[PDB]
């Protein structure tokens, strides 16, 4: 399927134990997609002071369309030193590994895969 229905656990930035997916744009997009497949991916909502607490390169989910079965259609955009790899809509948040942190909420997304 070109799209997969996912429910992403929303984590508080100060709870996150593994603050990024790796060390290159290509690695973080690869790792994010693997973790999204494996159900081991969390979402942090972007506000003032969040991104400096996480590790670059960043992987964003961004709204790709204006929402089947309650799931917002999204795609992945990476960012490193202020350059984005991909072009998409509004940020829903930044992806991180999930290693058992307790979420505050779930975000239903339809991921372009
Ligand atoms: C290949 N695949 C199967 C299920 N999900 C995938 C992805 O690449 C995804 F985009 F979801 F990360």
From Swiss-Prot:
Signal peptide annotation: none
Domain CoV Nsp1 globular: 2-113
Top-rank taxon, per record: Viruses
Compartments where found: Host cytoplasm
Residues covered by region (Disordered): 1-113
Function as written in the Swiss-Prot or TrEMBL entry: Inhibits host translation by associating with the open head conformation of the 40S subunit. The C-terminus binds to and obstructs ribosomal mRNA entry tunnel. Thereby inhibits antiviral response triggered by innate immunity or interferons. The nsp1-40S ribosome complex further induces an endonucleolytic cleavage near the 5'UTR of host mRNAs, targeting them for degradation. This inhibits the integrated stress response (ISR) in the infected cell by preventing EIF2S1/eIF2-alpha phosphorylation upstream of stress granule formation and depletes host G3BP1.
Protein name: Host translation inhibitor nsp1
Organism: Severe acute respiratory syndrome coronavirus 2
Interval of the full protein contained in this chain: 11 to 125 of 7096
């Amino acid at each position: 399927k070109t799209h997969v229905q996912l429910s992403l656990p929303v984590l508080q930035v100060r709870d996150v134990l593994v603050r990024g997916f790796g060390d290159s744009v290509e690695e973080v997009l690869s790792e994010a997609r693997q973790h999204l497949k494996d159900g081991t991916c969390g979402l942090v909502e972007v506000e003032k002071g969040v991104l400096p607490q996480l590790e670059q390169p960043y992987v964003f989910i961004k709204r790709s369309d204006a929402a089947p079965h309650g799931h917002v259609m999204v795609e992945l955009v990476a960012e490193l030193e202020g350059i984005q790899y991909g072009r998409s809509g509004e940020t829903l948040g930044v992806l991180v590994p999930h290693v058992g942190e307790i979420p505050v909420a779930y975000r239903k997304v339809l991921l372009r895969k």
